[PDB]
UniProtKB/Swiss-Prot annotation, chain A:
TM stretches of this protein: 2-22, 70-90, 100-120, 146-166, 172-192, 214-234, 245-265, 286-306
Catalyses which reaction(s): a ubiquinone + NADH + 5 H(+)(in) = a ubiquinol + NAD(+) + 4 H(+)(out)
GO biological process: aerobic respiration; mitochondrial respiratory chain complex I assembly
Protein name: NADH-ubiquinone oxidoreductase chain 1
Keywords assigned by UniProt, alphabetized: Electron transport, Formylation, Membrane, Mitochondrion, Mitochondrion inner membrane, NAD, Respiratory chain, Translocase, Transmembrane, Transmembrane helix, Transport, Ubiquinone
UniProt GO MF annotations: NADH dehydrogenase (ubiquinone) activity
Enzyme type, top EC level: translocase
Stated role: Core subunit of the mitochondrial membrane respiratory chain NADH dehydrogenase (Complex I) which catalyzes electron transfer from NADH through the respiratory chain, using ubiquinone as an electron acceptor. Essential for the catalytic activity of complex I. Essential for the assembly of complex I.
Record EC number: 7.1.1.2
Residues with PTM N-formylmethionine: M1
UniProtKB/Swiss-Prot annotation, chain B:
Segments traversing the membrane: 24-45
Protein name in the entry: NADH dehydrogenase [ubiquinone] 1 alpha subcomplex subunit 13
Subunit structure as annotated in this protein's UniProt entry: Complex I is composed of 45 different subunits. Interacts with CARD15, but not with CARD4. Interacts with STAT3, but not with STAT1, STAT2 and STAT5A. Interacts with OLFM4.
Top-level taxon in the UniProt lineage: Eukaryota
Compartments (UniProt record): Mitochondrion inner membrane; Nucleus
Gene source species: Bos taurus (Bovine)
Disulfide pairings: none
Organismal lineage: Eukaryota, Metazoa, Chordata, Craniata, Vertebrata
Biological function: Accessory subunit of the mitochondrial membrane respiratory chain NADH dehydrogenase (Complex I), that is believed not to be involved in catalysis. Complex I functions in the transfer of electrons from NADH to the respiratory chain. The immediate electron acceptor for the enzyme is believed to be ubiquinone. Involved in the interferon/all-trans-retinoic acid (IFN/RA) induced cell death. This apoptotic activity is inhibited by interaction with viral IRF1. Prevents the transactivation of STAT3 target genes.
Gene expressing this chain: NDUFA13
Sequence similarity: Belongs to the complex I NDUFA13 subunit family.
C-alpha cells in the first residue's frame, strides 16, 4: 500500500494552503482593526471552498498572439517540481530515505527560475517580454547567497543526509551558533519566493481563470516549503522513538509560526526599487558570506570537534 | 443666546515629537551577541566528540565480526 501513502500526502497538503488565503487575510485583517470573512463562514471557514468553484466556471480565453504548446507547458512543471520537492522530507520519517538530499532540494529549486522564463517569453510583447526577464535576473542572484551559507552548517552538522540532522540538534537549537546566518538564511529565502519587500514580481496578467489558479497554487506551495525546510534545519525538535506522535505535534506548530512571518513582514514594509535590490547583494551580503564561510572551517579544526561520518 | 464658546476646560495636546525609549545602546550591544555565540560553540566538543566516541563504537562492531 505504498500508493495510499502518496495520495495521503499530495491531497492533504493542497488543503493546507487552499485554507491559507483565508488565513492570509484574517491575519491581515486583525492588524487593520477589521474582522475576517463575516457573512459566509460564519467564522470564515466556508469562504475559499466557494471561491475555488468560480475559477473553473469562468471562461479561460486564450491568447491568439501566442503558441499553445508553450503556454500550458509552464503550469505542467509548476505543480511538477514544486510538489516533488516535498518528497525526501522527514516528519520524522521521510517518504524516501535519500542518502543525500540537501543537494536535492537545491537541485529542484534551481528549476523554479526555469518556469518564469517560459510564460513571459512565449506569450507577448514588452511587459511580458522585458518585464519577465528581470525577475529571473534577480532570482539567479539568490542561489550563490543561498548555497554557500547552506554549506557552512554542513561542516558542523556532519554530512549531506537529513536523517542525521535530527540527532545532531537534539540539544542545541542551532540558531545559537549561526544567528548571523539566520538573517541571511531567512532574508535570501524570502527574496527567492517572490514576496512583498523583495518584489518587482505580465507573467500573471495574461492568465485567465483557468491557469492563473495554478501559478497562484504553486507559488503558495513554495512558501510553506521554505518554512518547513528552515524548520528541520535551524529549529530542530526533540525526537522520541517510542512516541512518534509527539514529534509531529511540536513539528508543524513551529513551522506554522514561521509561516505567519511572511504574512507578518508583508504588513510592514515597502519595496526596494530594483537598482538597489541587487546592489544590496553583491556589495553588501556576499562579502560577509565568504567571511563566515571561512569561519566554520577553522573553528571545528581549532576545537578538535570534527563531526563524525 | 444659546451659542457656543465655553468658559473653561482646555489642554492642549502637545505639538511635541519625542519617544526616546532606548534601548540598551552603546557597547551593551555586541556583548550579548558574542558570548551567546561562543556558548553555542561551547555546546560543541561535548556532543561531536561524544558522537565521535560512539562513531568508533559503531565501527567497532563491524571489525569485531567478519572473519
Ligand atoms: C568578531 C567576532 C566574530 C564576528 C561576529 C560579528 C557578528 C556580526 C553579525 C552580522 C551578521 C548580520 C549582518 C548581515 C548584514 C545585514 C544586511 C545589512 O546590514 O545591510 C544594510 C542595509 C543596506 O543599506 P546601508 O548599507 O545600511 O546604507 C544606508 C546607511 N544609512 O541597510 C539596512 O539596514 C536595511 C536592512 C536590510 C533590509 C531588509 C530588512 C527586511 C526585514 C528583515 C527582518 C529580519 C528578521 C530577522 C531574521 C528572521 C530570523 C530567522
Amino acid at each position: 500500500m505504498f500508493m495510499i501513502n502518496i495520495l495521503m500526502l499530495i491531497i492533504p497538503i493542497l488543503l493546507a494552503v487552499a485554507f491559507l488565503t483565508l488565513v492570509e487575510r484574517k491575519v491581515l485583517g486583525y492588524m487593520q482593526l477589521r474582522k475576517g470573512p463575516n457573512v459566509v463562514g460564519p467564522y470564515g471557514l466556508l469562504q475559499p471552498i466557494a471561491d475555488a468553484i468560480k475559477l473553473f466556471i469562468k471562461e479561460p480565453l486564450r491568447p491568439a498572439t501566442s503558441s499553445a504548446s508553450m503556454f500550458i507547458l509552464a503550469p505542467i512543471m509548476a505543480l511538477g517540481l514544486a510538489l516533488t520537492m516535498w518528497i525526501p522530507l522527514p516528519m520524522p520519517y521521510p517518504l524516501i530515505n535519500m542518502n543525500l538530499g540537501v543537494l536535492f532540494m537545491l537541485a529542484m529549486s534551481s528549476l523554479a527560475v526555469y518556469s518564469i522564463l517560459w510564460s513571459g517569453w512565449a506569450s507577448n510583447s514588452k511587459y511580458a517580454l522585458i518585464g519577465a526577464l528581470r525577475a529571473v535576473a534577480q532570482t539567479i542572484s539568490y542561489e550563490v547567497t543561498l548555497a554557500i551559507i547552506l554549506l557552512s552548517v554542513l561542516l558542523m552538522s556532519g554530512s549531506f543526509t537529513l536523517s542525521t540532522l535530527i540527532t545532531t540538534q537534539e540539544q542545541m537549537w542551532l540558531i545559537l551558533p549561526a544567528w548571523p546566518l539566520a538573517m541571511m538564511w531567512f532574508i535570501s529565502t524570502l527574496a527567492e519566493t517572490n514576496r512583498a519587500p523583495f518584489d518587482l514580481t505580465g507573467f500573471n496578467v495574461e492568465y485567465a481563470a483557468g491557469p492563473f489558479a495554478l501559478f497562484f497554487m504553486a507559488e503558495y506551495a513554495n512558501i510553506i516549503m521554505m518554512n518547513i525546510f528552515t524548520a528541520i534545519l535551524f529549529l530542530g525538535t526533540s525526537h522520541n522513538p517510542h512516541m512518534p506522535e509527539l514529534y509531529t505535534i511540536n513539528f508543524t506548530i513551529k513551522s506554522l509560526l514561521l509561516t505567519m512571518s511572511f504574512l507578518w513582514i508583508r504588513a510592514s514594509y515597502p519595496r526596494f526599487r530594483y537598482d538597489q535590490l541587487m546592489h544590496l547583494l553583491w556589495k553588501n551580503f556576499l562579502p560577509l558570506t565568504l567571511a563566515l564561510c571561512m569561519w566554520h572551517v577553522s573553528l571545528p579544526i581549532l576545537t578538535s570537534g570534527i563531526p563524525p561520518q | 443666546k444659546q451659542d457656543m464658546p465655553p468658559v473653561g476646560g482646555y489642554g492642549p495636546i502637545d505639538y511635541k515629537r519625542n519617544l526616546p525609549r532606548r534601548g540598551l545602546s552603546g557597547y551593551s550591544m555586541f556583548a550579548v551577541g558574542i558570548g551567546a555565540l561562543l556558548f553555542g560553540y561551547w555546546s560543541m566538543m561535548k556532543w561531536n566528540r561524544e558522537r565521535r566516541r560512539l562513531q568508533i563504537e559503531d565501527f567497532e562492531a563491524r571489525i569485531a565480526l567478519m572473519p
